[PDB]
Amino acid sequence: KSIISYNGNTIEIPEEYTKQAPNRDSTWAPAQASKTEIYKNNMVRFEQKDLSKQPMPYAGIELIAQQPVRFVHGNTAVCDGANHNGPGAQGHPKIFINVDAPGSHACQYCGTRYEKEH
Amino acid sequence: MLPGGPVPVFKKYTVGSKGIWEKLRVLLAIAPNRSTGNPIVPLYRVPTPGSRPEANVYQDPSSYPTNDIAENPYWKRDHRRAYPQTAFFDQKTVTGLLELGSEATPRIADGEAGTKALANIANGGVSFTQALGKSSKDVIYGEVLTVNGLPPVAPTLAPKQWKIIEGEAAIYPKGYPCRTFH
Amino acid sequence: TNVETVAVAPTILRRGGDWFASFGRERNSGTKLFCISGNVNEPCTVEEEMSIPLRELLEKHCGGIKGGWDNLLGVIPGGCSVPILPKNICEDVLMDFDALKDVQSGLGTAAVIVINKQQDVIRAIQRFAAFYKHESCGQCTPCREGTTWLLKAMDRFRTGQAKEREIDMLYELTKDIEGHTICALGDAAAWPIQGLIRNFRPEMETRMKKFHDEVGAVSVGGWMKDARVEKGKVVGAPLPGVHH
Numbered sequence: 001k002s003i004i005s006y007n008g009n010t011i012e013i014p015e016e017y018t019k020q021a022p023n024r025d026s027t028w029a030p031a032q033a034s035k036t037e038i039y040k041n042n043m044v045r046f047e048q049k050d051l052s053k054q055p056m057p058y059a060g061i062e063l064i065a066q067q068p069v070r071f072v073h074g075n076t077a078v079c080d081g082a083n084h085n086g087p088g089a090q091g092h093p094k095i096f097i098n099v100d101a102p103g104s105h106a107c108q109y110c111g112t113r114y115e116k117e118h
Numbered sequence: 119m120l121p122g123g124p125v126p127v128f129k130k131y132t133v134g135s136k137g138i139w140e141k142l143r144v145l146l147a148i149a150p151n152r153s154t155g156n157p158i159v160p161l162y163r164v165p166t167p168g169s170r171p172e173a174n175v176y177q178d179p180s181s182y183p184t185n186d187i188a189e190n191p192y193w194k195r196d197h198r199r200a201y202p203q204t205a206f207f208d209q210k211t212v213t214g215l216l217e218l219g220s221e222a223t224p225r226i227a228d229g230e231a232g233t234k235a236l237a238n239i240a241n242g243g244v245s246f247t248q249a250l251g252k253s254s255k256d257v258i259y260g261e262v263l264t265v266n267g268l269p270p271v272a273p274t275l276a277p278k279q280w281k282i283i284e285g286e287a288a289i290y291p292k293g294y295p296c297r298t299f300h
Numbered sequence: 301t302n303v304e305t306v307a308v309a310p311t312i313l314r315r316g317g318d319w320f321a322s323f324g325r326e327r328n329s330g331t332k333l334f335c336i337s338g339n340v341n342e343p344c345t346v347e348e349e350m351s352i353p354l355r356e357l358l359e360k361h362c363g364g365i366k367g368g369w370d371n372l373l374g375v376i377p378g379g380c381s382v383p384i385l386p387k388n389i390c391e392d393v394l395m396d397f398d399a400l401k402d403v404q405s406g407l408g409t410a411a412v413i414v415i416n417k418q419q420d421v422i423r424a425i426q427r428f429a430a431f432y433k434h435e436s437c438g439q440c441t442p443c444r445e446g447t448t449w450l451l452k453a454m455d456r457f458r459t460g461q462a463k464e465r466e467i468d469m470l471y472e473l474t475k476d477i478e479g480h481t482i483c484a485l486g487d488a489a490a491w492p493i494q495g496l497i498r499n500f501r502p503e504m505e506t507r508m509k510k511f512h513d514e515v516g517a518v519s520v521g522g523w524m525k526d527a528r529v530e531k532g533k534v535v536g537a538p539l540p541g542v543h544h
């Protein structure tokens with residue numbers, strides 16, 4: 001990608017590093033700065049540096065859309081992101097989701113979805 | 119021996135010598151009791167803290183009357199909102215205790231008469247020196263000083279009667295310029 | 301007013317009043333329809349003077365108890381809004397407001413509900429709690445919530461899924477309701493469980509021991525040791541009452 005600097009020059013950056021994350025291009029929030037506006041404002045400190053080795057973790061908004069929906073019999077689904085493998089809580093506070101309404105419903109802490117069997 | 123040593127080597131948990139080298143060490147040691155100080159690898163810090171079995175059975179500890187679920191109201195074990203007030207006593211509030219008395223030893227007239235008697239002192243009606251001179255012997259010797267007439271001493275909450283240990287129990291022998299108090 | 305309270309009145313006025321005072325004890329005068337029901341030989345509806353003994357009412361105007369007077373576990377003399385009575389106190393207790401009040405009960409609509417020993421009294425009380433849950437108007441906090449807690453507890457005590465100290469917890473839960481409501485339905489939702497606890501405690505404890513032997517150990521709240529939230533549901537333990 002070729003990003004135009006403010007001072008009239010250009011900023012060449014390869015495509016693998018303009019993506020907001022290795023699994024998603026676009027931003028997932030209105031106030032999020034896109035990588036192009038980042039570079040365009042901060043190339044003085046990116047110039048001789050290697051972009052392969054900079055931190056580029058995966059996004060969760062796309063890895064949680066992949067997770068299959070869960071189902072239940074009733075107007076409630078209980079969630080507690082508990083490991084069940086090691087001791088202690090290790091999860092998030094118990095949350096009872098209402099699932100009577102036609103669509104899926106997600107926990108507010110984790111994005112796991114629940115539905116009323118249909 | 120005393121309750122504080124000396125103790126041998128085979129009860130100290132240190133890495134020592136073995137064989138002829140032990141005989142040589144006990145020969146060439148100022149005090150053969152003493153240890154190298156290197157801990158014993160099989161024991162010290164084993165099992166490692168990140169592999170203790172006891173963490174799976176662990177549960178948050180508690181005490182009975184506070185973990186009781188039925189007759190355990192908080193307003194009985196709320197010790198913070200029961201905090202003792204900071205009392206304040208200016209000369210006015212002290213002369214009233216002198217000219218008058220106290221709930222334990224009243225000397226006050228009944229009715230609105232005694233009420234205005236309190237009121238005369240609430241304002242500058244009678245002074246502290248005036249009621250110090252108007253105080254009979256039973257007042258002072260029994261409410262300011264002691265019954266014996268002596269003044270009170272700086273009180274101690276938790277008194278300490280000291281005692282000296284000398285000779286064999288003492289931390290240091292007699293010659294040294296330090297001693298030992300119980 | 302109650303229907304009967306005005307329905308009688310023309311006759312009390314026509315006929316002089318004093319004879320009505322001649323019925324019953326000093327402050328509990330007159331006649332009172334009694335709707336008997338339950339495990340009685342002959343369920344009936346009858347009219348009698350107040351201060352009549354409970355035992356004559358059970359034996360004469362009806363067919364006595366089904367199975368004999370000593371096949372009696374308890375009796376409820378005012379409907380569900382009144383604590384149950386034990387057999388010891390049904391031997392000589394008059395059916396008036398005062399004496400029933402003197403045994404920590406009361407006369408309601410004078411509807412007697414009888415219960416033999418072949419019955420699960422705990423099933424009767426949890427049913428009354430499910431009723432009051434269904435009839436709470438949903439306005440004031442203690443009835444909205446306390447009734448559902450009481451149901452969730454009584455459904456567990458029915459199978460033993462509890463500890464013994466949960467009964468004293470339950471007594472406190474009723475005291476969380478007994479005076480903090482608007483209407484009287486909150487007190488009426490409390491009292492029968494106070495009467496069960498006061499009298500028939502060992503049956504509760506015995507069902508609990510029966511659970512501890514037949515299923516497994518239990519903690520506060522009906523959580524066992526293998527209980528877990530797996531995939532939106534609790535799986536490691538039975539769940540009493542859930543039907544939805």
Ligand code: SF4
Nearest residue numbers: 437438439440443483
């Ligand atoms: S106690 Fe009475 S007023 Fe309050 S919520 Fe229950 S039914 Fe309604």
Ligand SMILES: [Zn+2]
Nearest residue numbers: 079080107110
């Ligand atoms: Zn969740």
